[PDB]
Ligand binder design. Sequence first.
Ligand SMILES: *C(=O)/C=C/c1ccccc1
Ligand SMILES: [Ca+2]
Length: 274
Amino acid sequence: AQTVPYGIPLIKADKVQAQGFKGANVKVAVLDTGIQASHPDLNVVGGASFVAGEAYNTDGNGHGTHVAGTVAALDNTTGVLGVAPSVSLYAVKVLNSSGSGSYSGIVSGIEWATTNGMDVINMSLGGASGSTAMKQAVDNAYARGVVVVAAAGNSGNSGSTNTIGYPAKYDSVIAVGAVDSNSNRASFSSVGAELEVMAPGAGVYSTYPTNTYATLNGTSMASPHVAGAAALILSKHPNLSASQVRNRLSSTATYLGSSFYYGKGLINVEAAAQ
Ligand SMILES: *C(=O)/C=C/c1ccccc1
Ligand SMILES: [Ca+2]
């Protein structure tokens, strides 16, 4: 039997899938710690690794496999179901097994995705500081027509202080925050002017290293929900430009409160893919 994580219906992804739109033909690149490509509930089509000593189709951490599951866990009779289960999945390793990567490695991953025609780029990662090379890479990917989504950060609140990290803080990237199954913002969600939209980030059940499934907390989990949404909006209207897909997501988001804490609100893909 196959489980449906609360995040799927909450963002109304189930309604879009039922219409027949599941992201078929859309290329999504997950810039993470890799993916356990042999997982029975995943179908990695390709990818690349910029981490020394590790191939792209192995995940020694678990993080990348969990993020990859939220976006496209296969729709079958086992495991879980992803936001866009028919998406073309590419694993781009930019982080090591301990979950950390160098700027050059990330920038290399962003460029690889831009040159290989990826439609969406999910980056469930972030640093306190940015870099001109990284900023330039995302601006260019977005300008080339790629949707760039990034985890806002698990830094929480601090009296006015903006806690959004990079690359989420760039204009060319969608900064995603986290809400729980009750739709209340999770305590660990970063807050700041750059916050754009919210998505399920707490108690998220997804695929996990060595043919299993686990629950994780973080804006790392929220991010793949938006990348999966973008893929869904694109499989229904392959004619839209990145900024158009982007605007559809925030324009139709369900308002939750002050943009400093929730951006434009919780995403509603049934409204966005209209
Ligand atoms: C996810 O677990 C970590 C995501 C992330 C993104 C940006 C800044 C810090 C951490
Ligand atoms: Ca499944």
